[PDB]
Amino acid sequence: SMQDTVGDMLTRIRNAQMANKVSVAMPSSKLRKSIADLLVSEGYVASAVVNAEENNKATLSIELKYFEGKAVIETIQRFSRPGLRQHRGKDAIPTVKQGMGVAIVSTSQGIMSDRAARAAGIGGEVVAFVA
Amino acid sequence: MLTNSDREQIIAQYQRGENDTGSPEVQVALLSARINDLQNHFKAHKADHHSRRGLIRMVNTRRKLLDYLKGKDLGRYTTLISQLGL
Amino acid sequence: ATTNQLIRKGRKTIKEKSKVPALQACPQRRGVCTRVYTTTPKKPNSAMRKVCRVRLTSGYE
RNA sequence: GGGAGAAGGUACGCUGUUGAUGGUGAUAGGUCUCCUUGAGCUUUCGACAGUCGCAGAUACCAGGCUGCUGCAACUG
RNA sequence: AAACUGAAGAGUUUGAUCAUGGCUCAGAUUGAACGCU
RNA sequence: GCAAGCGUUAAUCGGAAUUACUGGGCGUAAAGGGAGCGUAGGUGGCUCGAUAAGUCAGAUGUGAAAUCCCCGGGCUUAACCUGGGAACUGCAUCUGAUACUGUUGAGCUAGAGUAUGUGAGAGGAAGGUAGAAUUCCAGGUGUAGCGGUGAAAUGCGUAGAGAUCUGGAGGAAUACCGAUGGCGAAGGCAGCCUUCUGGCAUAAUACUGACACUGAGGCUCGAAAGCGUGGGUAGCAAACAGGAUUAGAUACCCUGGUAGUCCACGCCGUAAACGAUGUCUACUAGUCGUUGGGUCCGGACUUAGUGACGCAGCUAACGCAAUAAGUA
RNA sequence: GUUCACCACGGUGUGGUUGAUGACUGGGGUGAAGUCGUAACAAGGUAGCCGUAGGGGAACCUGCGGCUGGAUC
Numbered sequence: 015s016m017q018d019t020v021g022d023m024l025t026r027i028r029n030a031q032m033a034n035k036v037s038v039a040m041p042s043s044k045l046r047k048s049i050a051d052l053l054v055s056e057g058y059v060a061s062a063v064v065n066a067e068e069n070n071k072a073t074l075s076i077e078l079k080y081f082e083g084k085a086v087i088e089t090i091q092r093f094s095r096p097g098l099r100q101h102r103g104k105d106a107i108p109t110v111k112q113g114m115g116v117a118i119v120s121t122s123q124g125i126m127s128d129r130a131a132r133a134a135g136i137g138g139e140v141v142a143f144v145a
Numbered sequence: 146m147l148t149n150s151d152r153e154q155i156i157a158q159y160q161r162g163e164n165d166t167g168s169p170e171v172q173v174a175l176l177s178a179r180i181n182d183l184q185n186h187f188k189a190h191k192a193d194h195h196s197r198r199g200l201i202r203m204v205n206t207r208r209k210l211l212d213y214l215k216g217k218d219l220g221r222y223t224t225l226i227s228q229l230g231l
Numbered sequence: 232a233t234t235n236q237l238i239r240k241g242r243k244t245i246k247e248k249s250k251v252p253a254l255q256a257c258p259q260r261r262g263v264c265t266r267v268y269t270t271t272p273k274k275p276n277s278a279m280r281k282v283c284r285v286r287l288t289s290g291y292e
Numbered sequence: 293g294g295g296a297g298a299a300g301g302u303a304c305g306c307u308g309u310u311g312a313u314g315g316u317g318a319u320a321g322g323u324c325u326c327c328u329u330g331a332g333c334u335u336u337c338g339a340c341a342g343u344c345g346c347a348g349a350u351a352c353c354a355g356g357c358u359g360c361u362g363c364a365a366c367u368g
Numbered sequence: 369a370a371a372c373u374g375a376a377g378a379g380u381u382u383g384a385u386c387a388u389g390g391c392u393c394a395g396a397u398u399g400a401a402c403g404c405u
Numbered sequence: 406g407c408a409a410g411c412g413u414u415a416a417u418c419g420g421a422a423u424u425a426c427u428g429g430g431c432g433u434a435a436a437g438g439g440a441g442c443g444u445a446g447g448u449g450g451c452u453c454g455a456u457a458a459g460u461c462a463g464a465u466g467u468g469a470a471a472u473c474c475c476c477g478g479g480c481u482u483a484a485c486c487u488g489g490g491a492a493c494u495g496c497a498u499c500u501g502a503u504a505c506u507g508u509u510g511a512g513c514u515a516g517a518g519u520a521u522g523u524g525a526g527a528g529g530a531a532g533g534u535a536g537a538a539u540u541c542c543a544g545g546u547g548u549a550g551c552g553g554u555g556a557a558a559u560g561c562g563u564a565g566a567g568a569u570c571u572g573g574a575g576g577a578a579u580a581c582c583g584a585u586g587g588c589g590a591a592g593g594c595a596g597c598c599u600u601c602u603g604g605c606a607u608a609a610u611a612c613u614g615a616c617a618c619u620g621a622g623g624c625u626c627g628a629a630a631g632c633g634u635g636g637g638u639a640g641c642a643a644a645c646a647g648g649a650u651u652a653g654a655u656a657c658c659c660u661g662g663u664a665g666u667c668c669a670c671g672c673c674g675u676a677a678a679c680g681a682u683g684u685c686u687a688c689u690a691g692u693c694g695u696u697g698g699g700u701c702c703g704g705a706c707u708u709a710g711u712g713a714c715g716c717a718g719c720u721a722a723c724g725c726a727a728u729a730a731g732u733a
Numbered sequence: 734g735u736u737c738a739c740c741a742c743g744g745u746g747u748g749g750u751u752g753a754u755g756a757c758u759g760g761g762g763u764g765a766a767g768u769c770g771u772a773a774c775a776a777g778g779u780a781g782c783c784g785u786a787g788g789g790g791a792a793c794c795u796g797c798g799g800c801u802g803g804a805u806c
Contacts, residue, residue, distance in 0.1 A: 016449080097447080099506065
């Protein structure tokens, strides 16, 4: 079945932008919202709002962006998959596109960009590369 | 096979509440009765291989449910297999 | 070739044996000629090449 | 199933001490009876120590054993 | 102040092509041997 | 081109992403296990807590010296020597953080299951029976051919064949329906009927509450052929025999024909067991069929299968393309 | 000193593993202006291939089941 919730999230975004869809929706979660919130604040997606559904369920809707008719998120790949987790120190965070992209890092201070982790001098789980 | 009249009687004996019919105890009790009932069919038809694959499935399902109870509530497990003789 | 499959079996490359086993990893070996003959090469070309069969100090002939 | 007692090894007498154990059961305590204790007799196994001889299964008694191969399945 | 600098391919299967895939080569190294000097 | 050396051989790494961790592949180039169930193991939904093991950070101790690298200093330069650093990815012990993994308490329903009503089906096992047709046996009619082939011949027939009619025996398969139709995990499964029995599809409500996926070994099942024992034996037919064709013909064709094919119980465990495509998830233009449902108003929609096309994407190309060989 | 205990060498028997050799024998490969055929590639002149069984100087043939990686339809 589904065993990579984070990978499913990125795959939904990757396919939706490949299909030029206006928005992508999926069942919500705090981990999913935390990554989606970072994508908004990094400037890769327009917005991400959580709608509380019935039976204690929620839907996370993300509004995608396109620049000159091309998807803003050129590549969004998962680095720390469940079959092989990747934790890095403060000096071993791998950069994306020589600092242009974002390596989403899960630190003890929450989900944040790789440039933020180095500024805070903190490592964590490098969960994805988005460029 | 089990009829509706007796199938409802096993549920009424292993009830965890009001008309639940979904608890691990009632499911294992239903499978156990069904498995024992089919022992008569397979005694006369031992070459029946396509039906026997179905019997193994509920044997496998009953094992999964018993593993779940043993991990969930040990007392609910040791008591249940005492009644069912497993 | 998953991660779990690699930490169970693991990539095993194979080393090639020596193409000159008689030398026994030595640059040169001395030997005694037991036959000094001539022979013909393979298909494409023709000649009478000089060959000596020598018994080496390594026990190979 | 066997081959197989394959092959091949070690111990074995006597004396003293000592441990375990089966049987029978007198004397007692609670009627061809039952239960516990158990004297005497007896059984089968050990251990330790010493001792004599060339030799302890000491006499009589009591398998020799292996390798290849033909034949017939075998008991008869 | 610095220790933070690093990555080349070629030949060969075919009438020709692209791919696959082996073989070979150009580099560095040695407690070296041998040949000429 | 090197130069007091220069070549050759041996040897290691490289180039080789040619064992691919960084960093490869498996439709057809080598490569998906025949299919499934499942043990160890790997991995794993949502929400509120606890813990701090993993993870991260800090401090401390340690990580010998030499070597490597950096900044200098002495040999006339260099090799060499040398001072201080950096590094030695590590290990240990404390402290802090709690996003994720681990361990736990409680809760949730969206994955997975249960109860209840309908439905389709060559799903499986055991019995019974029906009608065509072939073969054989026995009679009636009848007479000179039948059969077979590209031609023939072997063969059958004047002891009466073949043809035709009427009876009887027996075995095997089930025309039409019949369908990129259906069911099954695969292998496979077609007359009709009864009995025992598995799964699936479907609307709604109720229930359990992550019970899940995959799975080394293991086990189960597993076409045909084949083997053992016991039955049966019509047709077909390995082997075998004969006739042809041919230079030959241990073949193709012809006439026969035994094992087998059938049944019961066991072995065997293999197939181009193929979609040459492991299983399970989620997402990604569309169009036209078709099977089993369901809900609406002859249409429309929605499901679970089964097909034909066709974007993006992928591919060496062929081609695949919601039943992916696309995106993970 | 004597004696007993432990013990090295050494001896005995019986197996296991493994190297070299061995009359003869099986397939594999290389080599020439060989002998016998022509099995495959075209529908290769009986479509080929897979599993299995029987047969045959030899490629191979035949039966049963399967596949298209079969042209002509």
